[PDB]
């Protein structure tokens, strides 16, 4: 029931030096890269010749200039610009001068989820 | 023709602090994480409101204990174990004691390509 | 009592995108790079215009070929080579063929502490 | 003249998986972490039982809110805030409203060098 070296995961790394073989019941742990959020259990364990399932590193969201221009919005806090937001973090927008929240628009405050921000839309 | 913040790529990072806006003709550069190999041009450039296409970070290959056991092979160089190999790096195997390269088998020396190693197979 | 951007630390990174200003009572967190061990509290907090003290990323230890050759020792577990060990992890050595632990020698099992391994010594 | 595993350096990493032994004439390469600038030759080579000297990862500079407040300056470009600057990158300041560059002051444009920014000073 020994295991080989643990699997790489995107945007994360194991916290220890990889070995060529691991005894059953051995474990290793992952950490996601800085702006990535680790989803699930960080620890994998060797049992019956296989590692358990690694966690996922959930993607940050990047602000889009073109979407913001198109939707007539700007970041609310010019001194606190979350150009990259972690999964679970919120970004707050405002309508640009001379615009108002459209009907059916998402709230001006919106949450990053694995790369995706649902942007609000303002109308003149 | 200004651009917003540059896009994240898997397993790589930009080498400078991201800005909220970039003038046309501005550029930034990526670096892949250690065992990843950067494919293409590391530099992206802002033109006509869009960034050019970022490079790709090609995946390393991890040795599989179960595949090696199944194919009756071992690493040749026990003092030089490439448990993780970069894209473009080769790994050399040997047949286990009492086995020989099978017909149609890949060569004992084999090259990592973006996560995939084509393993040789030995028969008793 | 607002704070500016949080301080860089060696071999670690903050887990969120840095902002130009932070309100009092704001906090950010650090993570150390993979084989580094974070000593202390990962969180810093902004109070009275200053950040609290960041943690330290304690160094891994690298095995020395020259010291091992000089002290007539080898790693015990040739399939489980901790070429780099985390702070707090132990490395186990053996005497080479035809040698014995010297008097006053450190134990064959020894612990990495912030870059330093105290190696055992064997005599013919 | 064989070498052991290559040495860790602060804020950088080798680009290949470390091996337990290296033949003379072998080489490995370092990369610095994103906002660090690699000074010198990235490649180390094994000769006569020793690795050659690794490069240095030169530190980025972080803007100080307290120094800026004390010197009556602000960043010039509020849409292009280099909160962290690479070694060799310049940061441009302006005097705050109702102040002028002091005599003997450093230029408003100033260059980051391994963590240190020489800030300009303005007087009322």
A34: Cβ–Cβ under 8 A, 6 or more apart, which residues? Answer: C13, C14, C15, C16, C31
Residue among B13, D83, A65, A96 at smallest CA distance from C22: D83
Given CB atoms, is D3 within the 8 Å cutoff of chain C? yes
Question: Pick from C34, C85, C86: which is nearest to A13 by CB?
Answer: C34
Q: Looking at chain C, which residue has its C-alpha nearest residue A82?
A: C17
Mutate to test the interface with A, among C16, C18, C88, C117 (most CBs of A within 10 A): C16
Q: Which chain A residues contact residue B63 at CB under 8 A?
A: 4-5, 20
A107: Cβ–Cβ under 8 A, 6 or more apart, which residues? Answer: A120
Q: What is the 3-state secondary structure (H, E, C) of A29-81?
A: EEEECCCCEEECCCEEEEECCEECCCCEEECCEECCHHHHHHHCEEECCCCCC
Given CB atoms, is B64 within the 8 Å cutoff of chain D? no
Q: Could A80 and C20 be called an inter-chain contact, meaning their C-beta atoms sit closer than 8 Å? A: yes
Cα A98 to chain centroid, rounded: 33
Residue among C40, C39, C58, C51 at smallest CA distance from C2: C51
Q: Could A86 and C15 be called an inter-chain contact, meaning their C-beta atoms sit closer than 8 Å? A: yes
Q: Could A81 and D81 be called an inter-chain contact, meaning their C-beta atoms sit closer than 8 Å? A: yes
Q: Could B81 and C78 be called an inter-chain contact, meaning their C-beta atoms sit closer than 8 Å? A: no
Q: Looking at chain A, which residue has its C-alpha nearest residue B81?
A: A20
CA D13 vs CA A10, C28, D44: distances in Å: 18, 25, 12
Q: Domain map of chain A by residue range?
A: 10-59, 60-124
List the structure tokens of A95.
């309508």
Output the DSSP codes for chain C.
--B-SPPP-TTEEESS---S-B-TT-EEEEEE-TT-EEES-SEEEEETTEEPPP-EEEPPEE--HHHHHHHTEEES-TTS--SEE-TT-EEEEEEPTT-EEPTTPPPSEEE-BTTB-----EE-
Asked if domains A10-59 and A60-124 share a fold, the reply is yes
Q: Could C4 and D64 be called an inter-chain contact, meaning their C-beta atoms sit closer than 8 Å? A: yes
List the structure tokens of A30.
């992952």
The answer to whether the beta carbons of residues C17 and B13 sit under 8 Å apart is: no
Q: Could B15 and D35 be called an inter-chain contact, meaning their C-beta atoms sit closer than 8 Å? A: yes
Residue among B80, B66, B76, B77 at smallest CA distance from B96: B76
Q: Which chain A residues contact residue D11 at CB under 8 A?
A: none
Give the angle subtended at the CA of D36 by the CAs of D31 and D37, to the nearest 5°: 75
D22: Cβ–Cβ under 8 A, 6 or more apart, which residues? Answer: B80, D2, D3, D4, D6, D28, D46
Given CB atoms, is A64 within the 8 Å cutoff of chain B? yes
The answer to whether the beta carbons of residues B72 and D5 sit under 8 Å apart is: no
Given CB atoms, is C48 within the 8 Å cutoff of chain A? no
Cα D91 to chain centroid, rounded: 14
Given CB atoms, is C83 within the 8 Å cutoff of chain A? yes
Question: Virtual CA dihedral for A97, A99, A100, A105, nearest 10 degrees?
Answer: -110
The answer to whether the beta carbons of residues C102 and C121 sit under 8 Å apart is: yes
Q: Is B93 helix (H, G, I), strand (E, B) or coil?
A: strand
Q: Could B85 and D60 be called an inter-chain contact, meaning their C-beta atoms sit closer than 8 Å? A: no
The answer to whether the beta carbons of residues B27 and B3 sit under 8 Å apart is: no
| Residue count (chain B) | 124
Residue B71 backbone dihedrals phi, psi, to 5 degrees = -95, 0
Mutate to test the interface with B, among D4, D13, D15, D83 (most CBs of B within 10 A): D15
Resolution for this experimental structure (Å): 1.8
The answer to whether the beta carbons of residues C32 and C14 sit under 8 Å apart is: no
Given CB atoms, is B105 within the 8 Å cutoff of chain A? no
Q: Could B65 and A18 be called an inter-chain contact, meaning their C-beta atoms sit closer than 8 Å? A: no
The answer to whether the beta carbons of residues C24 and C1 sit under 8 Å apart is: yes
Question: Pick from A17, A18, A78: which is nearest to D78 by CB?
Answer: A78
* Chain C touching partners, 3 or more CB pairs below 8 A: A, B, D
Rounded-to-integer distance, Cα A33 and Cα A56, Å? 11
Q: Looking at chain B, which residue has its C-alpha nearest residue C79?
A: B78
Q: Could A35 and C15 be called an inter-chain contact, meaning their C-beta atoms sit closer than 8 Å? A: yes
Q: Could A81 and D78 be called an inter-chain contact, meaning their C-beta atoms sit closer than 8 Å? A: no
Residue among A54, A57, A115 at smallest CA distance from A89: A115
Mutate to test the interface with C, among D11, D66, D80, D81 (most CBs of C within 10 A): D11
CA B87 vs CA A49, B54, B67: distances in Å: 26, 18, 19
Rounded-to-integer distance, Cα B30 and Cα B16, Å? 9
Q: Report domain C60-124's class.
A: mainly beta
The answer to whether the beta carbons of residues D25 and D45 sit under 8 Å apart is: yes
Residue among D61, D121, D55, D120 at smallest CA distance from D88: D61
- Widest Cα–Cα separation across chain C: 67
B88: β partners: none
Solved using? X-ray
Given CB atoms, is A78 within the 8 Å cutoff of chain D? yes
Question: Pick from C17, C18, C78: which is nearest to B78 by CB?
Answer: C78
Given CB atoms, is B80 within the 8 Å cutoff of chain D? yes
Given CB atoms, is A24 within the 8 Å cutoff of chain B? no
DSSP B68: H
Given CB atoms, is D19 within the 8 Å cutoff of chain B? yes
Burial B44-81 (b: 16+ CB within 10 A, else e): bebeeeebeebbbbbbbbbbebeebeebbbebeeeeeb
Q: Is the dihedral of CA C31, A23, D7, C108 positive or negative?
A: positive
Parallel, antiparallel, or unpaired for β A109-111 and B12-14? unpaired
The answer to whether the beta carbons of residues C2 and C21 sit under 8 Å apart is: yes
Burial A37-71 (b: 16+ CB within 10 A, else e): bbeeebebebeeeebeebbbbbbbbbbebeebeeb
Q: Which fold has domain C10-59?
A: Complement Module; domain 1 (2.10.70)
CA C74 vs CA A102, B77, C87, D15, D22: distances in Å: 71, 17, 20, 26, 16
């Amino acid at each position: 029931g020994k295991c080989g070296p643990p699997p790489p995961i995107d945007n994360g790394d194991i916290t220890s030096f990889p070995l060529s073989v691991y005894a059953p019941a051995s474990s290793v742990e992952y950490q996601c890269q800085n702006l990535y959020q680790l989803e699930g259990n960080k620890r994998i364990t060797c049992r019956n010749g296989q590692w358990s399932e690694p966690p996922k590193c959930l993607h940050p969201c990047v602000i889009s200039r073109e979407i913001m221009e198109n939707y007539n919005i700007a970041l609310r806090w010019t001194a606190k610009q979350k150009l990259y937001s972690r999964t679970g973090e919120s970004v707050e927008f405002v309508c640009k001068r001379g615009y108002r929240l459209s009907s059916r628009s998402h709230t001006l405050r919106t949450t990053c989820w694995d790369g995706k921000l649902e942007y609000p839309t303002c109308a003149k």
